[PDB]
Design a protein around this ligand. Sequence first.
Ligand SMILES: [Zn+2]
Ligand SMILES: [Zn+2]
Ligand SMILES: [Zn+2]
Ligand SMILES: [Zn+2]
Ligand SMILES: [Zn+2]
Ligand SMILES: [Zn+2]
Ligand SMILES: [Zn+2]
Ligand SMILES: [Zn+2]
Lengths: 170, 170, 170, 170, 170, 170, 170, 170, 170, 170, 170, 170
Amino acid sequence: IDVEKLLELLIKAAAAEFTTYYYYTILRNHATGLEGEAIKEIIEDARLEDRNHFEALVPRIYELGGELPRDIREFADLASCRDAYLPEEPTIENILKVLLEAERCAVGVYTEICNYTFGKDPRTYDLALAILHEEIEHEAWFEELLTGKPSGHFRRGKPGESPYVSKFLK
Amino acid sequence: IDVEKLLELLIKAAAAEFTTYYYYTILRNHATGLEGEAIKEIIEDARLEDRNHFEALVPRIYELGGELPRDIREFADLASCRDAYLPEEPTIENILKVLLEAERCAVGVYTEICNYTFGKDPRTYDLALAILHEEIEHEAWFEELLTGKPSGHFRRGKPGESPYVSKFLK
Amino acid sequence: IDVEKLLELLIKAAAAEFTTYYYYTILRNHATGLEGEAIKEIIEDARLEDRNHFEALVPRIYELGGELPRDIREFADLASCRDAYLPEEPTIENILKVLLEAERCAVGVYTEICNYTFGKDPRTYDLALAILHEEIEHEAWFEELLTGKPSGHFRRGKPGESPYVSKFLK
Amino acid sequence: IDVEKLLELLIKAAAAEFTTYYYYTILRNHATGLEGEAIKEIIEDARLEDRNHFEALVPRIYELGGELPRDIREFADLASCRDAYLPEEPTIENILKVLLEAERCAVGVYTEICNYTFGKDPRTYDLALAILHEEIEHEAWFEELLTGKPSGHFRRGKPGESPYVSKFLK
Amino acid sequence: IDVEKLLELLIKAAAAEFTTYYYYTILRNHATGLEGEAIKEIIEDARLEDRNHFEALVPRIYELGGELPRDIREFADLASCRDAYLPEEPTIENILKVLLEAERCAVGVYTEICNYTFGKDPRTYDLALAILHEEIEHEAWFEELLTGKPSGHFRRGKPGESPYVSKFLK
Amino acid sequence: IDVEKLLELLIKAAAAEFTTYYYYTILRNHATGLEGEAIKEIIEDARLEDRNHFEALVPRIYELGGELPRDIREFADLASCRDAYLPEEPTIENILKVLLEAERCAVGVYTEICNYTFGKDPRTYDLALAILHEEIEHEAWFEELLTGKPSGHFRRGKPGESPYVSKFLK
Amino acid sequence: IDVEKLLELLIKAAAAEFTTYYYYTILRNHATGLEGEAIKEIIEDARLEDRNHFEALVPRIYELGGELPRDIREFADLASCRDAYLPEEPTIENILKVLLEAERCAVGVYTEICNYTFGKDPRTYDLALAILHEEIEHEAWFEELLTGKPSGHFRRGKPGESPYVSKFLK
Amino acid sequence: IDVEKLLELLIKAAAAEFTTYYYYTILRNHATGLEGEAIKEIIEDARLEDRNHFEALVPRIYELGGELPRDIREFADLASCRDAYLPEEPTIENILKVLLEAERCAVGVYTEICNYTFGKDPRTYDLALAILHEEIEHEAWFEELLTGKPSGHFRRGKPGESPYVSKFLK
Amino acid sequence: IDVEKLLELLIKAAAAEFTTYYYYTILRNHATGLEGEAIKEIIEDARLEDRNHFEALVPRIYELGGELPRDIREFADLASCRDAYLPEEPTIENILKVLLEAERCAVGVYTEICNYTFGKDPRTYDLALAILHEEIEHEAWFEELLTGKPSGHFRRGKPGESPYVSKFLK
Amino acid sequence: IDVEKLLELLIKAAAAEFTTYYYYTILRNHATGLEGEAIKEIIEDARLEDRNHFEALVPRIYELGGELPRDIREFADLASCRDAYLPEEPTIENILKVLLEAERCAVGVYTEICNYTFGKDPRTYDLALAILHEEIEHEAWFEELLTGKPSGHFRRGKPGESPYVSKFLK
Amino acid sequence: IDVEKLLELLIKAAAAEFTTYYYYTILRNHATGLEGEAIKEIIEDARLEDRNHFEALVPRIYELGGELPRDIREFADLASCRDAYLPEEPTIENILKVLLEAERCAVGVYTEICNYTFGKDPRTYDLALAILHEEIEHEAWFEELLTGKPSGHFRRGKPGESPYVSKFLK
Amino acid sequence: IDVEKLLELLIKAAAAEFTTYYYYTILRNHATGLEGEAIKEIIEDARLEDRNHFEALVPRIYELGGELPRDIREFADLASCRDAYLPEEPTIENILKVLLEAERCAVGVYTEICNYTFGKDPRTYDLALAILHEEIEHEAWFEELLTGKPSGHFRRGKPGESPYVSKFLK
Ligand SMILES: [Zn+2]
Ligand SMILES: [Zn+2]
Ligand SMILES: [Zn+2]
Ligand SMILES: [Zn+2]
Ligand SMILES: [Zn+2]
Ligand SMILES: [Zn+2]
Ligand SMILES: [Zn+2]
Ligand SMILES: [Zn+2]
């Protein structure tokens, strides 16, 4: 494997998780009314998950010999996903579409890393697989709320418990 | 009391609880959308309760000298209640009607056992009373969601905790 | 059974528990001095018990098709027991007599309900029996402090834990 | 400060909390249907909070030299807020308006006490501030459910935990 | 009911539990070898249960107006069951027969009390029923170890937890 | 990968776990006597494990676009393993052989799924690996009890804790 | 050391603890009134301690090659202390004197065993010392309640916790 | 504010708490007899509170640039309150008067500090307010035991838990 | 008070806490060697504290009628403190100076808010005071590590527990 | 005492515990079949105990001025007990004899140390006594499984809890 | 033994522990800088230990018939050890020497008491031995920090847990 | 795969972990002084980890049909890594170099096993990966203490918790 190529893929993924933590705070506060009361807890659970993903990725970057960029504005411009802006018409349906779009991009990011490290870098592969578990969970959540397709999941116990990536956390 | 007559009433009740555990799994996964998100947790709580009822009934059957049928298909054909099939038009209202119908049949089953053992079999009477407590709870839940009649109950703390039958469980 | 007659008996019992919670607060604060320090903890335990009894009775009233009165003053006038007023001479002996009188009336109230529902309404009978357990406990407490007759009970661990009615509480 | 004037302000506030505990029980049981299932847990959380506020106010009244009125009907007539009666047309919107009206009156009551004791009675000021924290929370809850204005709060963990007034509770 | 007749039945039952606690200590220590290692834990569980039964019966005797005999030797001579002496040939089979004989006598004792108090003394009936639950458990344990008849029970979690009589214990 | 082919392999595996839960209940109750007391706890641990495996498989089936069959009898006929019937001569040796045969079939089922999804479906591969961990454990348990070959395992702490599949459970 | 002489000293001590458990139950129930409410908790703590002492002594007797007597009446006649009978005039002062007399005899019993085994039997010496710790505690409790001599101890946290002999208990 | 003047007020307060911890140990051990058994637990609770107050004050003194005196005898001579000596006639009434006198002096000390720092030193004001909460509690305790004036407080759960100053403790 | 002026002061403070969370991650990873091992835990504790401060400020901004800026880069440019860049010569002394400079700016920010809201906005004042408690703690930590001036504090128990602002957190 | 002579006795004892940890692992894995299932848990408990004994002895050796040998093979040759090899015919009886022989040698080792340090080295004597408690326990376990002599002990709660030496462990 | 001579030895030891608690507070706050950060936690652990030793000694003094001196200044002048003053040049090396000197004096004090009570006063001997365990621990800590001699101990879990004297504490 | 070749690779790895547990005990006790106090806790954490690795490897060896060597000296001679002897000049730098050398050899051992079993033995591959996670952690710890290269890790919570291999432990 090319370590430099792998390092630039991991830093871009970490930037996406960091900005997602900020934008999901705005989306949660605008899901108001009787209909929005249901989805407030689901958004909160997803937002705390992505903060934990940022925590897990940083130590692996430094083990491989990389470093974070000096200035925070340069870090935000390196995100592999588009910003989840608040829609111009902030209705429940338009908020749900923005969340679904962000989740499908995250699934593609971590699928690409697994293909690159399969059978070559055992520790990096295992960490990417653990995060991919929780991203697929979030994608099924929102597609069931927007369309009618069954997903097989219901409410968690406590937001941000992250059962797949806990062994990587301090 | 006729022990043979009492034994056949208890085995039929145990079959109904066992099949209810399977059918409620299908019903939970099809309660989708924004409206269905509310009732997913209530269905899950009821499904875990009926699994515990099956656990409590089996030891009493063997104390009285009975046994379960050899083949599982013969056991399913002995259920005292009709199968809770998924409706042809799976809307929220049609799912709620199926759940309400199943609950009212369960209340009748355990009311009949209490009349049979009143003042004659103290241990069998106490177990039937404990299960009847939780069945009346579930019936009031669904009738309040379907009609507008007040019931007096709200969300539990943890699904399947079964506060009335715990002393019978291991 | 006559459901209307049973409903009016349960609403009157709930009113007695609600007013008892208010009056026992006054009685506790006036048991002063070295002698009163002993009985302060016993009064506190009894007061928290009766609050739990009010919590358990309300859901059963709504299951049977009843409702609470609109105005709170009309609810207070329906109590099946006399008000436990602070005596004109507030000594330790006179406070103890008021407490004993209130407890014996509560025992009579729940004994009457059990006779009415014996072998006819299994769920209502079980709830009335659970509360009657704790009322008999309180009656023995005060009669031993006032007279010299042994009772067989000593200090609880934590006030208001209510070991007989917990399975009815949320 | 005039102690007599301060005492009459605290007793009136305690009466409002005591009657609010009764009336919110009726309002919770009438929030039925699919829409009402969402708001049942919020009403329950608010009702348990106001019971704790009554518990905290009573000891301070006796420290300052006051006492509760002898008869419970006279206590109910001293409440500083109007009774939260069940509306004639009990729909979800009409129930929400009654709850919002009660909360705004409570905020005004405790704001007035803080102005009176600022820099003169440190212990009374601190207790009034703690209750005012939770009243402002409840007001933002209901105004977001009725209108569309964002509030910044979502579901609590356990009803009645009261994180601001716990240090005053036993 | 005749209170004097009921009191003498309860005192005799309490004597049997007290002596059973002593004799089961001897039986446990003589179940040696590879075969006896299995049954040591079952005997220990039963011995701790009967100590709890003695604890529960004493307060009810004093509530009804009775008292324990002055001298401990007179108390031991009032037991309603025969002494569980260590057999002359202390083999595993002979120890098991002694245990089975003691359990069947206990079941008969508490069945008789329930018939006497059915529908007349609600509190005494409930306590007798709770102990009868655990005695029937112990009887099924030993008959399955001696004969081959299935019983439906296996190892408990912690000896002496007594899940049916806990609400009567301090 | 062919999603339709993968879906039919997962549904057949889920049917085997569901029927295993029923048949192991019969086998546990017939392991009587002094010799059978040892193996009762091991059978109980295995039975609770397979119930958890059914819980983990169902959500993944719905994520991939599958569904459970409508009728429960059709579900039972799809099991990938033969029914673990009670032997005609129910001795300890014959019960042990039936258990060993069922375990070796389960190991083959999940080994086949891992080969199919290796390096192509990361989430499905990880779930199949987790269940395969516990199946290999159970196989070593029974082969050591039947033959004399050492296995390296001894008693668990609490039955059904399932340390390998917990992160997939709710 | 003479093992036979040591064995007869340990069996007599175990008999005293066993009978003390019975007699203290009677003494606790007769400490009535306002004055007796204080000492009820102290008697309860001492009674549970002596039950634990009986539990600790029995295993050591069997290690040294002794056994308990066959019949329970012969065991009671071997106690090294006189029976703590209820006084003819059961006042608080007369009950306190009986308790003090029993405690001073227990201190003498275990002091004698320590002198016999000092520097010869390390395990027997350590067990006798542990029990002597708690007996000296109880003696100081009662002498301070009867006379005015300060003792240095106040209320325990939970009765029967036995902090000195716990490491000998199961 | 004058920092030097504020520093000398805080050091004198810390000396009073340190000496109070020593003198209350003597007072607790001399509250003997049946009457003194009640007040032993209250004195113990107050003594542990004042030890915590000393712990909280020391870090703030060093933040502001002060230091403790070199020799411990000079520290004891700086206390702002008089020593709580054991009275010449150590009866329960005379001990209670000494405790009441010490508490009223402590209330005056911390009231003076709050007036000095109001609106000028936010952190010092908050710490002084927290300690003043618990001193007012202790004053009401003793005045109710000595006179008959109601106070509104009863027994704590665990001595020295200090619910108002915990956030300042390590 | 001017609500618009207060809102712009709170948003700027929230931006400083958000960027501090990013920059302290870089500073912690560069405190290497034997000397840096000591200060790694202190930096980690401070970094988790400032994340909690961001969590507490956001709900109050929305209660007052404000909102966060749309784009994350605009939010970062509004911080009231300068960026804590990694020094060009990353030695232990130069890292310590950067940390000390950031802490003194935070103390000034929250002191200014308290002066603005004193006696006018009770809820905003209390929240600002709670954060100011922990900022003064951090300032004393670093000044003692850089200079020799005593501070009065030592190691916490668990990083990020935040004992002063917990009641504001979910 | 001769410190050099005491040091060589403690190092030899530590070597025996270290090698016992290795050899008991082999013995546990070869106790197969239905008979061996009983004794697997007892061997596991003893093996974890001896690991804790090695942990406790090492700090005391360094306090007295000793050190461990440089090479691990020289350490193994200093053991005061013979190696517990797997018998040539590995049956249950032959394994039990090897375990019994090892335990009796350990009892002799620690009895010798206590005689040497009695009344001269209080800290070394106390540590040797604590380990001797658990060795006598293990000796009674195996002699009861091999012969029929009663021992007075049954199954522990959790292996390796070591209730006598815990205060010496970290 | 001479009780008067033993009493004066115990009172002098209690005075040393009480003054040590004050002086160690000053020493902890002056161990500043990067080097002092390591030893702050060790000093804190030792200071909390000596407070517990004072708690354990006081009850034994009153059991033997002694009392504390009336005035606190007379108590401080009776200490058996010299005051641990802050050195004129407060460097890390000079602080360490003061701590080491205080610890060696404490070891001598409790060694002397054990020689006096060996085989004559079992309860006093056991308490002196327990404290001597922890004093020897502290002595080894400081001698390893000052010189290079290995000690065998490392960081505790929680300061002031005192594992050897806990059974003497309330 | 060749099972014989795989078995000899696993036995050699288990020998290295067993000897590492002994040698790290010597290294920890010689890291003295002010500088060594920092690294004592890190060495302790690593030593407890390697003991857990030995526990996990032994059961897998017996599942595959292998066994441990008869004599412990032959087991020690099979280690795949060189002995970590104490250096002739035991300074902090020389101890750190020995630890770093041992860790890099362990990383190579488990990397080799993963390459051998990739896609052929799923259970053996997963266990080797779990241990490789923790070995890479330890390698980064020591290289950051010796050189200045950042690693990204700081202090654990409790030594020997082993978050990656726990699911393999009992
Ligand atoms: Zn993410
Ligand atoms: Zn059911
Ligand atoms: Zn309120
Ligand atoms: Zn019994
Ligand atoms: Zn104070
Ligand atoms: Zn050992
Ligand atoms: Zn000390
Ligand atoms: Zn390792």
